[PDB]
Amino acid sequence: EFNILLATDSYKVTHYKQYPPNTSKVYSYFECREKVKYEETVFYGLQYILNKYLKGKVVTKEKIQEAKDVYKEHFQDDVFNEKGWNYILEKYDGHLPIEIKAVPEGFVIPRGNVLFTVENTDPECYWLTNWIETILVQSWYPITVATNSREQKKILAKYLLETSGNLDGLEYKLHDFGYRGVSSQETAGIGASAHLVNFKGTDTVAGLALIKKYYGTKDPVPGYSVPAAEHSTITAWGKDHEKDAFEHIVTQFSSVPVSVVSDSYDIYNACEKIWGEDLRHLIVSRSTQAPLIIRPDSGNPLDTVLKVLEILGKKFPVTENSKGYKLLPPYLRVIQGDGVDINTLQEIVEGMKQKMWSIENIAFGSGGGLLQKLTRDLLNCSFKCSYVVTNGLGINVFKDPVADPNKRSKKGRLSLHRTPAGNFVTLEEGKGDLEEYGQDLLHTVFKNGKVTKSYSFDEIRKNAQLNI
Amino acid sequence: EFNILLATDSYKVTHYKQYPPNTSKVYSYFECREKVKYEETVFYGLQYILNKYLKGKVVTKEKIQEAKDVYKEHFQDDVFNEKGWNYILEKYDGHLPIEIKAVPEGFVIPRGNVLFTVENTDPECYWLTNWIETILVQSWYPITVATNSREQKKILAKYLLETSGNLDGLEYKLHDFGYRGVSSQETAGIGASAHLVNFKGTDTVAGLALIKKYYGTKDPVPGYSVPAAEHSTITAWGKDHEKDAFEHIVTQFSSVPVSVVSDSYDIYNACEKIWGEDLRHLIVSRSTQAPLIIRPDSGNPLDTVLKVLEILGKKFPVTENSKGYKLLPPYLRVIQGDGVDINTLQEIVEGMKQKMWSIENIAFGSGGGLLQKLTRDLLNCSFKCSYVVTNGLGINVFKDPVADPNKRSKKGRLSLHRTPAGNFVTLEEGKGDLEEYGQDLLHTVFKNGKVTKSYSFDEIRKNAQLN
Numbered sequence: 001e002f003n004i005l006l007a008t009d010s011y012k013v014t015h016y017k018q019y020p021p022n023t024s025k026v027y028s029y030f031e032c033r034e035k036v037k038y039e040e041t042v043f044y045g046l047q048y049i050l051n052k053y054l055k056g057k058v059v060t061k062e063k064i065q066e067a068k069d070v071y072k073e074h075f076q077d078d079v080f081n082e083k084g085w086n087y088i089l090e091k092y093d094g095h096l097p098i099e100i101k102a103v104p105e106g107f108v109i110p111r112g113n114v115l116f117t118v119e120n121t122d123p124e125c126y127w128l129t130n131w132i133e134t135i136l137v138q139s140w141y142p143i144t145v146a147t148n149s150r151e152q153k154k155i156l157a158k159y160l161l162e163t164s165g166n167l168d169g170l171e172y173k174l175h176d177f178g179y180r181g182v183s184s185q186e187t188a189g190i191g192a193s194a195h196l197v198n199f200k201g202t203d204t205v206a207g208l209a210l211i212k213k214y215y216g217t218k219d220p221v222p223g224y225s226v227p228a229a230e231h232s233t234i235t236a237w238g239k240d241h242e243k244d245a246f247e248h249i250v251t252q253f254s255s256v257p258v259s260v261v262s263d264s265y266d267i268y269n270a271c272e273k274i275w276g277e278d279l280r281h282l283i284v285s286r287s288t289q290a291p292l293i294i295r296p297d298s299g300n301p302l303d304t305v306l307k308v309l310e311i312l313g314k315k316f317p318v319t320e321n322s323k324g325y326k327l328l329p330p331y332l333r334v335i336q337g338d339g340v341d342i343n344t345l346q347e348i349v350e351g352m353k354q355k356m357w358s359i360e361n362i363a364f365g366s367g368g369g370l371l372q373k374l375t376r377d378l379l380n381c382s383f384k385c386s387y388v389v390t391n392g393l394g395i396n397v398f399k400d401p402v403a404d405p406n407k408r409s410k411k412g413r414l415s416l417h418r419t420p421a422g423n424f425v426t427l428e429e430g431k432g433d434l435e436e437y438g439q440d441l442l443h444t445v446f447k448n449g450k451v452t453k454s455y456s457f458d459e460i461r462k463n464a465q466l467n468i
Numbered sequence: 469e470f471n472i473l474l475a476t477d478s479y480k481v482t483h484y485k486q487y488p489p490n491t492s493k494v495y496s497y498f499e500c501r502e503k504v505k506y507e508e509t510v511f512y513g514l515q516y517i518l519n520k521y522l523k524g525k526v527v528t529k530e531k532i533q534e535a536k537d538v539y540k541e542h543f544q545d546d547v548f549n550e551k552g553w554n555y556i557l558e559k560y561d562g563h564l565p566i567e568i569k570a571v572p573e574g575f576v577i578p579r580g581n582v583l584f585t586v587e588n589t590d591p592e593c594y595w596l597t598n599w600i601e602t603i604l605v606q607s608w609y610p611i612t613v614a615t616n617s618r619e620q621k622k623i624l625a626k627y628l629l630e631t632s633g634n635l636d637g638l639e640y641k642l643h644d645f646g647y648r649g650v651s652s653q654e655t656a657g658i659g660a661s662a663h664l665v666n667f668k669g670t671d672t673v674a675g676l677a678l679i680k681k682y683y684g685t686k687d688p689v690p691g692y693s694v695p696a697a698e699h700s701t702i703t704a705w706g707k708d709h710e711k712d713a714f715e716h717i718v719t720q721f722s723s724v725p726v727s728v729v730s731d732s733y734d735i736y737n738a739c740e741k742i743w744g745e746d747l748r749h750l751i752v753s754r755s756t757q758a759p760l761i762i763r764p765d766s767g768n769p770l771d772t773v774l775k776v777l778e779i780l781g782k783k784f785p786v787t788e789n790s791k792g793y794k795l796l797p798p799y800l801r802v803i804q805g806d807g808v809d810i811n812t813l814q815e816i817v818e819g820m821k822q823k824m825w826s827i828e829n830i831a832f833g834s835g836g837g838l839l840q841k842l843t844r845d846l847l848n849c850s851f852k853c854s855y856v857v858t859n860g861l862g863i864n865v866f867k868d869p870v871a872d873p874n875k876r877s878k879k880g881r882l883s884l885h886r887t888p889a890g891n892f893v894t895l896e897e898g899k900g901d902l903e904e905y906g907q908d909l910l911h912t913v914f915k916n917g918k919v920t921k922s923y924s925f926d927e928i929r930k931n932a933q934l935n
């Protein structure tokens with residue numbers, strides 16, 4: 001049912017009429033333009049797009065007719081290029097005559113570098129390069145989710161290492177709760193998969209299926225969850241029976257970790273009186289492999305975390321780890337899953353450290369902040385034409401708006417290189433062909449309807465690892 | 469290839485073990501909780517979800533086995549409720565034993581009112597009400613896009629009325645440019661469909677297909693566009709040939725409206741020297757039905773709009789309308805489609821009014837600001853359990869967190885009524901059954917796998933009209 005002829009910005013339908021006459025090549029590129037800092041970006045998600053939308057026979061006689069009929073009404077005019085699309089159907093069996101070169105998935109690249117390039121492989125299809133901009137520029141989302149997720153991992157690693165002396169359990173310190181808070185089922189899958197580049201905990205089941213279909217893992221699944229209560233399973237017992245709900249849930253899940261939302265009526269009373277006194281005998285009996293994870297879900301996230309830890313530290317036996325930081329017993333942990341984004345995550349771990357609480361005690365859950373409150377503007381994700389051939393001559397093209405030099409685009413044929421210090425540089429104006437900086441790091445990943453280079457999710461996770 | 473058994477928050481897989489024993493009924497509701505204020509919301513998008521995801525045979529033996537295999541690995545344990553899902557397959561031929569009642573689509577409802585309710589119709593399926601919360605709560609996105617778009621329409625209507633004395637072309641004053649700035653193809657269609665509740669201009673073609681399939685219009689399409697240049701079609705001509713690019717494009721599109729991005733190198737030079745002198749002869753000759761629409765795309769959105777209008781006003785014949793506001797000639801208009809969201813739109817029309825420019829002169833295009841930069845928290849969209857039947861006894865259920873009184877949920881069986889002054893009131897604790905108000909405004913839209921009541925896009929548009 002997907003029709004690539006109907007998967008572009010409307011105005012692109014009219015572009016074949018606007019290019020200079022005798023244009024044989026249009027060459028475009030994607031970058032996260034330069035200027036939390038977000039100095040480096042995780043390149044993730046293009047392989048999903050190539051496989052789901054671009055590869056194989058994407059043009060049929062029925063798809064051309066459907067698009068002709070929609071655009072006739074949408075524009076109230078006959079501007080649709082049926083001839084160009086028929087050419088692709090008849091000459092290439094509806095395979096796109098396009099070459100895409102990209103940096104490997106999971107690579108961590110500084111801002112302002114070429115990440116992928118797109119060009120037509122047939123001169124008659126000069127107009128196709130920018131037709132597919134809309135579908136390829138959506139790459140911004142998994143790039144931005146993967147990047148923002150990795151930036152939160154860097155904060156958790158710094159504070160976990162300072163307060164505990166190791167990074168054990170780091171991949172489980174940020175759990176994806178974003179399924180309800182995203183705009184669609186398709187978005188849930190894409191965003192959850194991008195989070196699983198960096199972490200292993202997710203409630204967003206749609207992410208597992210996407211990874212298995214488009215990337216692959218050695219392991220049966222790329223992420224995991226544990227049993228957890230919500231407000232409906234506590235509040236269903238009645239206002240006077242919160243203790244009965246808690247006793248039932250921890251007894252049902254006595255041998256596995258279990259998360260219990262504790263703020264239905266009064267989080268402080270739940271921690272001090274219900275967990276800390278009435279049900280304490282059911283908690284101190286649990287295995288190290290099956291902790292109670294208390295989940296506050298309302299109020300000021302920092303103030304609530306600090307008060308919950310002070311409460312639990314007075315009702316349960318607290319130890320002092322080798323770094324001097326307080327540690328709850330191994331059958332008891334906290335997860336803060338409300339109001340968490342990269343800024344509040346920083347504030348909580350810093351406030352915990354100042355009160356001498358180990359980051360071993362806490363994990364975070366993020367919903368909207370992890371998968372929804374991100375824009376194409378956060379990393380200045382941009383797709384621009386840099387090179388055309390018109391009357392057999394290559395010309396270097398760019399924009400350079402007077403009022404915003406940050407929107408200046410790169411000129412000519414691009415390539416990505418290692419510098420002598422081992423950093424990245426993007427060469428412009430075809431200067432990569434001089435091989436003063438060695439070989440281009442971009443690889444052909446799509447050519448003429450075929451995916452030509454692919455990466456497993458395992459390779460992507462290894463590429464995206466923290467420097468440590 | 470969608471499997472409703474795999475379309476929930478993972479933890480919901482475990483909830484059938486957490487509810488009180490002898491629970492026969494779980495009843496839950498959606499609202500935009502009370503605290504631009506966004507005092508009223510456009511209810512839009514549930515019918516999409518009911519038809520795409522919830523209706524008909526959604527359970528098969530193969531879907532149950534697939535779910536069982538995934539959950540075994542995801543939890544490293546066998547917690548999946550295979551028996552519950554098998555019961556629905558055998559007893560209802562895989563149709564969901566759920567009743568959903570909703571306010572009519574397009575209705576504009578004040579914050580803090582019930583918009584829809586969900587309950588199981590079979591006692592064995594008490595667990596199913598909140599299993600489908602994840603899919604249903606995503607209704608927040610079309611509600612929020614439709615609501616934010618209508619709030620922008622209110623600002624434009626106010627300023628167009630004060631500066632021009634009428635609302636002609638209001639439905640073409642905010643164009644959807646959001647396709648590349650959203651997170652997915654599916655989000656693009658949903659968001660574009662929500663904008664078309666209020667406006668007619670879109671570049672997001674995916675919205676048209678969604679409206680045709682799930683809602684329907686008397687007109688062949690719900691939304692329109694005009695030819696437009698992008699930086700690629702101007703810059704491809706070369707840095708020294710911007711004039712040649714502009715001339716080619718307006719000549720190819722001489723008899724239709726055409727938008728031309730004019731900031732590739734220098735927006736001010738383009739307006740004053742290229743449009744205003746070198747190509748002025750190809751502009752002043754155009755039909756009122758085929759204006760040149762100049763599109764700045766960089767800089768401070770307010771400062772750039774006001775400077776562009778000042779430039780054009782010195783190069784082209786400006787009139788003064790009956791309200792005393794300046795009006796460009798009919799063959800010349802402007803569209804600002806960079807940095808536009810609800811706050812900047814207000815800043816620009818207010819700044820224009822202060823410089824005595826009519827809002828007739830300007831349209832807005834919005835991308836990320838219109839379809840992407842919105843969260844479930846903006847309208848406090850929430851799905852909560854309000855009523856359960858345990859041991860044959862009905863109990864009013866709710867949350868009331870000590871630290872956030874704004875997160876208090878409603879109690880018991882709910883109903884939506886007209887007040888004697890013609891406002892809306894949500895009645896709690898089954899008090900709607902006393903019939904002290906008129907009829908419940910919630911109608912059954914889904915029952916036992918069937919969509920029971922459908923709205924056309926034309927009725928939705930009429931419900932969402934401005935006062």
Ligand SMILES: COc1cc2c3c(c4ccc(O)cc4c2cc1OC)C[C@@H]1CCCN1C3
Pocket residue numbers: 172175200201202224225226257288289290291293333363542543544
């Ligand atoms: C021993 O303490 C813990 C164990 C887990 C386990 C998982 C887990 C998944 C997501 C998440 O957000 C947290 C956790 C977790 C948290 C714990 O303590 C805070 C999944 C794995 C699959 C088999 C064994 N499971 C253990």
Ligand SMILES: COc1cc2c3c(c4ccc(O)cc4c2cc1OC)C[C@@H]1CCCN1C3
Pocket residue numbers: 074075076640642643668669670692693694725756757758759761801831
């Ligand atoms: C006469 O001036 C204008 C006309 C239009 C027309 C459309 C239009 C669509 C989207 C949009 O954002 C703007 C416009 C527009 C803007 C104009 O002036 C600024 C679509 C319709 C389909 C047949 C006739 N078209 C006219």
